[PDB]
Amino acid sequence: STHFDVIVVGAGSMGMAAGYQLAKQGVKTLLVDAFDPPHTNGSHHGDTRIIRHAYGEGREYVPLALRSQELWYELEKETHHKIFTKTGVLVFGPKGESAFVAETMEAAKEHSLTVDLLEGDEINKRWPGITVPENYNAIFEPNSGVLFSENCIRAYRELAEARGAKVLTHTRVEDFDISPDSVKIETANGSYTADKLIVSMGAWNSKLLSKLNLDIPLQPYRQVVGFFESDESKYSNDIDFPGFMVEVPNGIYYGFPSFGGCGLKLGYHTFGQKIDPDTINREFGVYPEDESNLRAFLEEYMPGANGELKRGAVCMYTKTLDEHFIIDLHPEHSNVVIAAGFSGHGFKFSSGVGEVLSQLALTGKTEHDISIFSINRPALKESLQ
Numbered sequence: 299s300t301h302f303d304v305i306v307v308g309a310g311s312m313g314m315a316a317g318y319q320l321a322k323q324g325v326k327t328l329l330v331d332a333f334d335p336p337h338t339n340g341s342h343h344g345d346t347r348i349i350r351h352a353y354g355e356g357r358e359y360v361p362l363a364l365r366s367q368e369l370w371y372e373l374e375k376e377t378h379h380k381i382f383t384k385t386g387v388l389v390f391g392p393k394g395e396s397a398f399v400a401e402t403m404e405a406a407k408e409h410s411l412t413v414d415l416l417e418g419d420e421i422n423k424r425w426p427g428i429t430v431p432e433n434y435n436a437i438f439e440p441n442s443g444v445l446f447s448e449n450c451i452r453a454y455r456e457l458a459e460a461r462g463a464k465v466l467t468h469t470r471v472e473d474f475d476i477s478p479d480s481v482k483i484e485t486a487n488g489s490y491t492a493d494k495l496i497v498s499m500g501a502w503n504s505k506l507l508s509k510l511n512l513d514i515p516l517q518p519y520r521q522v523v524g525f526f527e528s529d530e531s532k533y534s535n536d537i538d539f540p541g542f543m544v545e546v547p548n549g550i551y552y553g554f555p556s557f558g559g560c561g562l563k564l565g566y567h568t569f570g571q572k573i574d575p576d577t578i579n580r581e582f583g584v585y586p587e588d589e590s591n592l593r594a595f596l597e598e599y600m601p602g603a604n605g606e607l608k609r610g611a612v613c614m615y616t617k618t619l620d621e622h623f624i625i626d627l628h629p630e631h632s633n634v635v636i637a638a639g640f641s642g643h644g645f646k647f648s649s650g651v652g653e654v655l656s657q658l659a660l661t662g663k664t665e666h667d668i669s670i671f672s673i674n675r676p677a678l679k680e681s682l683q
């Protein structure tokens with residue numbers, strides 16, 4: 299017997315930020331999640347996430363990245379949970395052979411971002427512990443860094459709940475009933491109605507958007523990360539070892555300095571197993587590639603960080619065909635907002651995305667330019683049933 303102004307289905311990275319933005323404005327909000335966020339079944343665990351401003355995936359993301367950065371600094375002041383450490387982020391690759399490095403550089407010039415350019419031995423000299431070939435170049439961004447993702451979601455949840463948002467946990471939404479002036483969700487624990495709906499189910503968008511008559515290629519991937527015992531005199535955040543995202547011959551890798559001796563953390567971005575979010579094996583090490591793809595990079599480029607494996611985590615990406623996000627109104631229902639396909643690089647924007655989703659749900663528009671995320675773009679290959 300409780301109607302809400304807005305219902306958010308999937309209270310993870312994007313949904314919880316939207317919840318916070320809505321509650322902050324006195325909008326009566328219900329957030330429904332299959333688990334109890336933050337948790338380890340979706341796409342936000344593993345402790346840390348890189349935030350970069352000069353953007354190799356595309357200079358068009360810079361404004362949202364800068365706005366999200368300002369929002370993370372705001373969240374830091376609002377909660378007791380740790381949000382952001384300014385490790386700086388290093389990007390490198392073989393000279394003239396990395397579109398990612400090249401666009402990162404173009405993006406920095408175009409938006410007058412503060413960065414250092416260096417190459418070859420200068421990289422190895424500046425950061426003891428990194429060993430790249432002399433034909434590599436790099437762009438270092440000193441003011442970007444690392445977000446503590448589970449902390450972000452927990453903080454947004456606590457702040458939203460304090461302002462009246464309701465969070466219904468361990469409740470899987472199974473179907474939707476959309477009409478011109480209201481929305482309704484169906485779950486085993488009951489059904490709920492509101493004026494607006496935000497759909498942000500992460501990897502499960504690939505299985506449940508068809509319940510909203512949408513047919514968009516969204517492929518979930520199993521992506522692991524490992525924490526390794528390292529030489530702390532070289533890889534500690536305390537001695538300014540940076541976060542990094544780099545391109546080598548076999549693909550892109552990303553990583554984090556050791557924080558409080560937790561060990562250097564590394565992930566291989568280019569490869570992952572195609573999986574289903576309900577049958578993915580969440581145990582690290584069950585595939586030999588889990589650990590060997592990581593050590594292959596470490597022994598070659600960060601040799602002092604290739605010690606004993608201290609911890610592993612398994613998490614998921616949800617890729618669109620062009621690897622750009624989907625943030626838009628449902629093409630047939632202006633009272634339904636969709637947030638999907640973050641393709642392994644959406645967390646850093648979740649604060650800004652929460653803002654965009656709030657604006658779309660409340661007004662049908664946003665002050666942000668989000669055309670590159672249009673649900674109607676051809677490169678997406680979208681359609682209705």
Ligand SMILES: *Cc1cc2c(cc1C)nc1c(=O)[nH]c(=O)nc-1n2C[C@H](O)[C@H](O)[C@H](O)COP(=O)(O)OP(=O)(O)OC[C@H]1O[C@@H](n2cnc3c(N)ncnc32)[C@H](O)[C@@H]1O
Nearest residue numbers: 308310311312332340341348471500613640642644645646
């Ligand atoms: C996995 C991964 C991702 C990643 C990364 C490293 C790994 C191993 N490193 C990143 C980085 O350094 N920087 C960055 O900017 N991004 C990075 N990523 C990507 C980022 O984590 C993802 O793009 C982001 O987390 C996506 O957020 P989204 O909100 O889409 O996904 P979620 O946090 O998993 O939340 C979805 C929630 O919805 C719930 N759910 C699912 N189905 C239902 C149903 N049926 N009913 C109700 N709730 C549902 C989930 O339980 C989840 O909480």
Ligand SMILES: [Cl-]
Nearest residue numbers: 615616641642
């Ligand atoms: Cl993702």
